[PDB]
Amino acid sequence: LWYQLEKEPIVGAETFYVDGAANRETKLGKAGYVTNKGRQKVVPLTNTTNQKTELQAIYLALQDSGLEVNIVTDSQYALGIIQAQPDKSESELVNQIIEQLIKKEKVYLAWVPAHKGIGGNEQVDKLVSAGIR
Numbered sequence: 786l787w788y789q790l791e792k793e794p795i796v797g798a799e800t801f802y803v804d805g806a807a808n809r810e811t812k813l814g815k816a817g818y819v820t821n822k823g824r825q826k827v828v829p830l831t832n833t834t835n836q837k838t839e840l841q842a843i844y845l846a847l848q849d850s851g852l853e854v855n856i857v858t859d860s861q862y863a864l865g866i867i868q869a870q871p872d873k874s875e876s877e878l879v880n881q882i883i884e885q886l887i888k889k890e891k892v893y894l895a896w897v898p899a900h901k902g903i904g905g906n907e908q909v910d911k912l913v914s915a916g917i918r
């Protein structure tokens with residue numbers, strides 16, 4: 786079915802490093818990205834969870850990118866959902882992400898381990914984590 790993930794990075798395409806952070810007690814969160822072209826975004830979230838913020842971040846990257854995009858996440862949870870290539874989810878947010886994925890021409894989704902010195906990943910982590918932490 787209909788959408789396909791690239792097997793290797795798209796050379797020359799904007800690369801979005803995404804992350805989210807949420808506070809357990811307070812349920813406040815942030816989602817965001819930084820790109821290799823100097824683009825950045827951080828949005829505040831309420832009544833959220835870590836996994837929801839990580840999915841929110843990918844949705845933003847998808848909304849704000851062109852038809853070809855590389856996305857680098859540290860979330861295995863999100864990776865799983867997207868690599869599974871579902872038709873429909875019970876989650877509205879996942880369905881929105883799916884809708885956006887179909888509208889892309891090429892999407893590469895990479896995973897990196899959190900807090901292991903990957904440049905872009907550390908950058909966005911610091912962004913979304915500030916004030917939440």
Ligand SMILES: O=C(O)Cc1cc(=O)oc2c(O)c(O)ccc12
Nearest residue numbers: 804805839859860861899900910
């Ligand atoms: O790697 C970990 O310890 C858990 C973890 C998973 C994830 O998806 O995102 C994370 C993150 O953004 C952090 O700042 C710290 C830990 C995680």
Ligand SMILES: [Mn+2]
Nearest residue numbers: 804805859860
């Ligand atoms: Mn993360």
Ligand SMILES: [Mn+2]
Nearest residue numbers: 804805899910
């Ligand atoms: Mn982080």
